[PDB]
């Protein structure tokens, strides 16, 4: 029995229970809630340290011996913020807890046994979160995938065939042959992938064929015609096949207004993209659907957080993508009904209130694929600066707000697209898609990505250097990124129907192929920490937003965190 | 003889009861098995004699064993002895309820309860609705039935009951005799509020938009107390 | 929001948090520690109740829909004493918790979803424990298996070939051909089965062949010669194959005393049968090994609890099985050195102290296969009557003592024989071997046995009766006991080596075949609630037993609970 | 020829094996009991002594169907299993049929609502399987006419149509006159005797855990038993209104007494009303055929197996029962199962 | 009742004994089965009454049947009746030894033996060795144990006992009480004289060359009475 000062203990093994750590350069403070360690029995790797033959590596290991163990990791998950060791076996998370050798240490369970087959990854002073999930990908260029990978995203869900004009507008992979093209192209990449089909048709047979061809759901986009008939048919087919539907509603109100669209949805599960409407949607009041029980409301990162440069940038961006002219009054009228700084301001507060549940990209289609996580944490920091600490906090920390915002890109999109049994959280039994963060760089620049239980990307110095640290340091592909190893580390998500018909063997796919499930029986109440339903009213004239009778707004930010301190460009 | 399996089982039971009666004659205090068997064998023999009705045997099964005839703890373990016996008019089930009275202190499986009450449906506000059964038949409604879709013969302000259930103990029920009028408490249905079945009046997400469809469907199908405004506007999916 | 009196609430749904229930006719009081239910959302089956289409059975179930759910069960396990719903899917325990329909109820997770494919089993007012595990079976007659089944035992581990004299003495199935005989006979029974080989040889090849032929371990029995050489060889082979060794030591001290046997064991894992020594073992001091770290000490039920009739009964039993004569002084000297009422008395207290960790049978070989659980709870009741309530209790209950004694026949034998990843406890992921008890009959007569997730045995009235309750009621085989269903509900445990060589396909076995694992790296510290190591001294003259310098003894009982109140014979 | 075995039948009666279509598979020991009484086919549902099975003849879901189908390999009985019809999910209904069930049971304990009835009938029409129903005694979602409206003129097999075993109180028995209904009765109510009413009352108080000090439980019990409908049921059997006799085994019914109580009802009806007017001669041949059809050919037609079993006809399965006339209807001589003595 | 298979078996046994007692009352001389069952049923009933101990029942089982109550030959066939009965303190085994005395001449399976003795281990010369148990625990040695490798607490001239076993009847044993001193006879082990096991002191062919290795191993492991000369020369395989 010896006494150790908290300072040297934290320097050796990381923060322990009751300690607090700042996240990046923000004002969000994370407090360690619990510790799974036995004081005096910590796992350390190095010369003369504990992780050695006969001390912490067992000479008589259990049969569930780990392949990889992450020691002294601070886990930031929606299930809690705590210190533990993470054991990885066969691409899954095998255990969370103490970890070590049962011959020499007390509290070691068989699923956390370190033996001669175990690799050691030091996590002391580091944060472990689940890999991010981006559910609004326009597959416009393959170069988006490495960019999203380097920011902490491990699953991309969306649609497209490339730089075609249909893809530049829509997240749609249309038809069986184009699905086959994209599924065979997917074998290249270090990313979990799933593809959305075209929902914009009234032909049930055409809808069903795309699902059986491997798509995990439908996208309904106004550029292919978002009409109530197509919405109704697509929802009927999706209910028969248990796949998700995403919608980009009619901004022009051509076939009807927002209530007509809700009537076409008819109380069935729907995932709405850019619900605030700058990215498209019933002008000016698409944002009202974010209070409905059957809606899963997502936002795209270009509108968060609301800043002084946001409105002009979005205006000029809209004038370019739609080829509008400033000398035409009708184009101006369209643009003014579309941007609405009022709804953009309201969107940040709705994220703080838990009304919006998912953050996404809309990549290269008015969105930045490498900035979903960064803009989510910028929004959290701005909201804490404006509204102060949340009232759901328990202690001098921001743990509740941290969980609320972390769920927006990890667990809620996974639940929304029926993959939350594989990815989305640091839980035992799930796929080992993990991101290592140093707290000083949290939310902007990760340390390394573990994909399928193996290291796939990391910061790395020059190959000729005597150690891995010296400059230049940038993100480089690791061994799970190469050869036949990438087939074991990566998943292609398909529908249950396509999986049952042997889509993997028919198309000769070497990646893991998994079916999505539980997409039709979820509501807004199934989103973690973002399950607030409310009556949202939008003023047709002033465009003001009222939630439960009270006006909701935020003020723009002239400076954000996690932006110019961390990037050269 | 052409004995059936039932006859072999009943013969075994008769001789278990015979052993119990012999031990009782010897002065041994009977245990659980012996008491059960003695009651069952007595009922079977009485039904064979054919001089008593089944109800008489149900009452007579309670006088066979005094509390002093059994071991401590036996009386509290025998809630009911059921036995099927063949009377002159065929096979009838005779059940004896609490045949033996408790006299000791031993209670196997005794429950030691806290005296605090349980608060069910906490955080749910209850409204009160007056309901009358204008039909000629009794109606009973369980705790988790969607009260908007109860028997169309019940009359009440259905609009106020949409998306609600009875604020009573789970698995209990409220009865409505023909012509009976009483008020009940209704709480909001929890979870995802996805109402499927019950009369096919909703079969979708419960909300204000679907309440209009439900009210219109209820009025078309003659559910009492339904007042959905005329000039109804249909949606694309009804 | 309504108030419900505790009395009517408990009558409807069983005891809740803070309530206490007596176990059988004993003095042990169990307190419900926690409840997983939401008050007002309990699952009840019947006419007009909750478990109906659209209310608690989902009309849009998750894809992990349960096959069977046990509602409002009081779980008594070493992991705790609490109220929950148990969901069973595909022969495993799929979930423990709330259970129900997510459409109409708040706290329902996907693994506890009740849908149209779910069967309902009411457990309100009932106790659920894991199936018992008996690890000292002499396979002398097949009729032992139904007898142990009706008492709450779901796994039998032992050896034998039938009523042969070698089996009447030893739990040994000797050699490959006899192993094949017993493995093919096992296809008949409703019981998990595993067989021990002959360890009494100095030939390593002969030892290895038996393990590769399907045995899960060795028995070393003095009737085949318990010599240090055979012990050493058997332990070496077992360490190479990861199987357990059980030992019945030399009562005659022919090759050495108890310390010579411990020297032959040489600090390796060993499971000792009838460690107190009435069933055999170094006279008079075999019981001292129960304090060693590498020993897993078990007791057989004929010596517990110690009663007024115990000594004379054991004396006469010994005179019969060994064909001794009362007119021969050497036979008397052997008998007196063997019985030792002192060690028998000490054994009960050692069970109370956690020194002894496993209770077993020694069936039809001085032991009663249908009385392991009953005599365990009789010992617990006697110890509470003598020594009062344990000092490790937290509250006006006996929860700690209940867990300590329940571990002796559920989880500790499973850990000892390397099957604790399949059976031994009510935990998610484990095999659904469950026993339903009414608290008035707890520990002596169960309600029903669930085997492999299906009902295999239950109390049942006559088949011609209008309801299942009327007399005569006795234990009858259910549907999992018959046809090809019994092959899906039952496991034959084999060694990892035999499993890898396709023992299932070679012998044409239709039962599930599973390998034992983690047998060599466990010590006394791996036993739940029974991990007390101590220095045990036995007086060579007075046969008194001292633990850590203090004399340990118990007094005999002239009357026990759970005996004459519950049985006609 | 030389390959023929001889069985003497002089002075004996040969009937087809009985068919019991209301089995609660609560205990396997029911099967030998029904076998010894002359029943050779049992149709029903259940998984064992579980509370859902103690109430309903339902084998719910693919996995439980697989359990029971593999257990069935043990027994000397023709077996078929009913699935759960109490759902509004068409995919769940269809999966159970494709998993081996021969039909659906709709039971009020799982919720007999018009929506579930409608969906189950739609799926059954798509798969050509029978539907059996135990209607809502509490009139919770509607009365008997609402149930008939949900049935919408499609084929339905009603269990214990007189209603002591469950059903719209007090008037479920009216559906026994409809063209699309196959009305069955359970043996505990036939024949009507002096001990019937009290026995059924006490049985109901036990299975539903009712209390005599609660007026609502008494009101439920009185609306349920109705000695009037029980008395009417015997005459309706004599008139040919009721068409099938069944058991409701260990769920207020006796699996070894279907045939015996059928012939007891026939004997009681002949004692009360005399010889039927459809007789041709100084015999009871017409009445004998009418009552024999109630447990042999009518249930086989109802559950779509009347091309295999149900009658002594050339081409059919040799499921035959040998009776000595002195013991006819209570204790048979031998059972021939699949053309061999079982 | 929840009867177990054991309870059904014991009920059958009780009524077999009841039949035996009825026949004995009628004056019939009991046969083997009837006598066994009568004794067993009497013991079970006495244990149920709970007024006697198991030892009392062991003595009482011998007074139930006089020799004149059974058929000729019955007494010599019933060596011992064992029966497990449930007392107030649980289940105990009661065995009655030679319950009935022989009175006739009929002996089923009677053995007619030659009066000549059997000479065992013929052709084997026996040596005599004095052995003392200096330990505090009893030691018992069987007929075919390699006597060189007995418990190290026994003290005797081990060199003279190498390759030998006790010259006693096969399957018998010699006991050594703590402090006891006695002489025993040892004969040479037969067959191939390949000694494996027993303490791992030889584990090879027995001969003069291996006796030196065995003596050295015994001395190193503290076997009493072992005098192997110092300056031991090891071989290439030890
Ligand atoms: Ni869009
Ligand atoms: Ni987009
Ligand atoms: Ni033993
Ligand atoms: Ni043994
Ligand atoms: Ni029914
Ligand atoms: Ni029924």
GROMACS .gro file of N, CA and C in nm, chain C residues 109-160:
model
  156
  916UNK      N    1  -3.553  -0.292  -2.542
  916UNK     CA    2  -3.439  -0.305  -2.632
  916UNK      C    3  -3.462  -0.417  -2.732
  917UNK      N    4  -3.388  -0.411  -2.843
  917UNK     CA    5  -3.416  -0.499  -2.956
  917UNK      C    6  -3.400  -0.646  -2.921
  918UNK      N    7  -3.316  -0.679  -2.823
  918UNK     CA    8  -3.297  -0.818  -2.788
  918UNK      C    9  -3.406  -0.873  -2.697
  919UNK      N   10  -3.497  -0.788  -2.650
  919UNK     CA   11  -3.605  -0.831  -2.562
  919UNK      C   12  -3.742  -0.805  -2.624
  920UNK      N   13  -3.749  -0.807  -2.757
  920UNK     CA   14  -3.872  -0.775  -2.828
  920UNK      C   15  -3.964  -0.896  -2.835
  921UNK      N   16  -4.088  -0.877  -2.793
  921UNK     CA   17  -4.191  -0.980  -2.802
  921UNK      C   18  -4.269  -0.958  -2.930
  922UNK      N   19  -4.272  -1.058  -3.016
  922UNK     CA   20  -4.346  -1.051  -3.139
  922UNK      C   21  -4.437  -1.170  -3.156
  923UNK      N   22  -4.488  -1.189  -3.277
  923UNK     CA   23  -4.579  -1.302  -3.302
  923UNK      C   24  -4.513  -1.438  -3.291
  924UNK      N   25  -4.381  -1.447  -3.294
  924UNK     CA   26  -4.312  -1.575  -3.284
  924UNK      C   27  -4.277  -1.613  -3.141
  925UNK      N   28  -4.320  -1.537  -3.042
  925UNK     CA   29  -4.278  -1.556  -2.904
  925UNK      C   30  -4.381  -1.636  -2.826
  926UNK      N   31  -4.334  -1.735  -2.752
  926UNK     CA   32  -4.415  -1.807  -2.655
  926UNK      C   33  -4.403  -1.739  -2.518
  927UNK      N   34  -4.511  -1.743  -2.442
  927UNK     CA   35  -4.518  -1.677  -2.312
  927UNK      C   36  -4.513  -1.779  -2.200
  928UNK      N   37  -4.424  -1.758  -2.105
  928UNK     CA   38  -4.416  -1.837  -1.983
  928UNK      C   39  -4.426  -1.743  -1.864
  929UNK      N   40  -4.528  -1.762  -1.782
  929UNK     CA   41  -4.549  -1.674  -1.667
  929UNK      C   42  -4.456  -1.715  -1.553
  930UNK      N   43  -4.386  -1.617  -1.498
  930UNK     CA   44  -4.295  -1.644  -1.389
  930UNK      C   45  -4.324  -1.563  -1.265
  931UNK      N   46  -4.436  -1.491  -1.263
  931UNK     CA   47  -4.469  -1.410  -1.148
  931UNK      C   48  -4.489  -1.497  -1.025
  932UNK      N   49  -4.425  -1.458  -0.915
  932UNK     CA   50  -4.426  -1.538  -0.795
  932UNK      C   51  -4.337  -1.660  -0.799
  933UNK      N   52  -4.252  -1.674  -0.900
  933UNK     CA   53  -4.165  -1.789  -0.914
  933UNK      C   54  -4.019  -1.746  -0.914
  934UNK      N   55  -3.932  -1.843  -0.889
  934UNK     CA   56  -3.788  -1.823  -0.887
  934UNK      C   57  -3.727  -1.894  -1.007
  935UNK      N   58  -3.633  -1.828  -1.072
  935UNK     CA   59  -3.556  -1.888  -1.181
  935UNK      C   60  -3.411  -1.897  -1.136
  936UNK      N   61  -3.356  -2.018  -1.137
  936UNK     CA   62  -3.214  -2.042  -1.119
  936UNK      C   63  -3.161  -2.115  -1.241
  937UNK      N   64  -3.029  -2.117  -1.252
  937UNK     CA   65  -2.965  -2.201  -1.353
  937UNK      C   66  -2.983  -2.348  -1.318
  938UNK      N   67  -2.978  -2.432  -1.421
  938UNK     CA   68  -2.978  -2.575  -1.398
  938UNK      C   69  -2.856  -2.617  -1.317
  939UNK      N   70  -2.877  -2.714  -1.229
  939UNK     CA   71  -2.768  -2.765  -1.149
  939UNK      C   72  -2.669  -2.846  -1.230
  940UNK      N   73  -2.547  -2.852  -1.179
  940UNK     CA   74  -2.439  -2.926  -1.244
  940UNK      C   75  -2.381  -3.023  -1.142
  941UNK      N   76  -2.390  -3.151  -1.172
  941UNK     CA   77  -2.340  -3.257  -1.086
  941UNK      C   78  -2.215  -3.315  -1.150
  942UNK      N   79  -2.102  -3.307  -1.080
  942UNK     CA   80  -1.973  -3.341  -1.137
  942UNK      C   81  -1.912  -3.468  -1.078
  943UNK      N   82  -1.988  -3.546  -1.003
  943UNK     CA   83  -1.939  -3.669  -0.942
  943UNK      C   84  -2.038  -3.783  -0.967
  944UNK      N   85  -2.072  -3.805  -1.093
  944UNK     CA   86  -2.168  -3.908  -1.132
  944UNK      C   87  -2.096  -4.039  -1.156
  945UNK      N   88  -2.140  -4.144  -1.088
  945UNK     CA   89  -2.108  -4.282  -1.126
  945UNK      C   90  -2.218  -4.328  -1.221
  946UNK      N   91  -2.185  -4.345  -1.349
  946UNK     CA   92  -2.283  -4.388  -1.447
  946UNK      C   93  -2.309  -4.537  -1.428
  947UNK      N   94  -2.387  -4.567  -1.325
  947UNK     CA   95  -2.417  -4.704  -1.285
  947UNK      C   96  -2.548  -4.752  -1.346
  948UNK      N   97  -2.650  -4.667  -1.347
  948UNK     CA   98  -2.776  -4.700  -1.411
  948UNK      C   99  -2.829  -4.578  -1.485
  949UNK      N  100  -2.887  -4.598  -1.603
  949UNK     CA  101  -2.949  -4.484  -1.673
  949UNK      C  102  -3.060  -4.418  -1.596
  950UNK      N  103  -3.126  -4.489  -1.504
  950UNK     CA  104  -3.235  -4.433  -1.426
  950UNK      C  105  -3.191  -4.320  -1.334
  951UNK      N  106  -3.061  -4.305  -1.309
  951UNK     CA  107  -3.012  -4.190  -1.234
  951UNK      C  108  -3.041  -4.059  -1.307
  952UNK      N  109  -3.037  -4.060  -1.439
  952UNK     CA  110  -3.050  -3.936  -1.515
  952UNK      C  111  -3.188  -3.873  -1.498
  953UNK      N  112  -3.300  -3.944  -1.514
  953UNK     CA  113  -3.429  -3.882  -1.482
  953UNK      C  114  -3.443  -3.839  -1.338
  954UNK      N  115  -3.382  -3.912  -1.244
  954UNK     CA  116  -3.392  -3.876  -1.104
  954UNK      C  117  -3.322  -3.743  -1.076
  955UNK      N  118  -3.202  -3.725  -1.131
  955UNK     CA  119  -3.131  -3.599  -1.114
  955UNK      C  120  -3.200  -3.487  -1.190
  956UNK      N  121  -3.261  -3.519  -1.305
  956UNK     CA  122  -3.333  -3.419  -1.381
  956UNK      C  123  -3.451  -3.362  -1.302
  957UNK      N  124  -3.526  -3.448  -1.234
  957UNK     CA  125  -3.644  -3.404  -1.161
  957UNK      C  126  -3.610  -3.323  -1.037
  958UNK      N  127  -3.484  -3.324  -0.993
  958UNK     CA  128  -3.442  -3.247  -0.877
  958UNK      C  129  -3.383  -3.111  -0.913
  959UNK      N  130  -3.366  -3.081  -1.041
  959UNK     CA  131  -3.310  -2.955  -1.084
  959UNK      C  132  -3.171  -2.959  -1.143
  960UNK      N  133  -3.116  -3.076  -1.170
  960UNK     CA  134  -2.984  -3.090  -1.230
  960UNK      C  135  -3.000  -3.105  -1.380
  961UNK      N  136  -2.926  -3.024  -1.456
  961UNK     CA  137  -2.931  -3.028  -1.602
  961UNK      C  138  -2.802  -3.072  -1.668
  962UNK      N  139  -2.692  -3.085  -1.595
  962UNK     CA  140  -2.567  -3.135  -1.648
  962UNK      C  141  -2.512  -3.240  -1.552
  963UNK      N  142  -2.478  -3.357  -1.605
  963UNK     CA  143  -2.411  -3.461  -1.528
  963UNK      C  144  -2.275  -3.488  -1.589
  964UNK      N  145  -2.171  -3.479  -1.506
  964UNK     CA  146  -2.034  -3.508  -1.546
  964UNK      C  147  -1.984  -3.621  -1.458
  965UNK      N  148  -1.924  -3.722  -1.519
  965UNK     CA  149  -1.873  -3.835  -1.445
  965UNK      C  150  -1.820  -3.943  -1.537
  966UNK      N  151  -1.817  -4.066  -1.489
  966UNK     CA  152  -1.771  -4.176  -1.571
  966UNK      C  153  -1.835  -4.306  -1.527
  967UNK      N  154  -1.822  -4.405  -1.613
  967UNK     CA  155  -1.875  -4.537  -1.587
  967UNK      C  156  -1.924  -4.601  -1.715
   0.00000   0.00000   0.00000
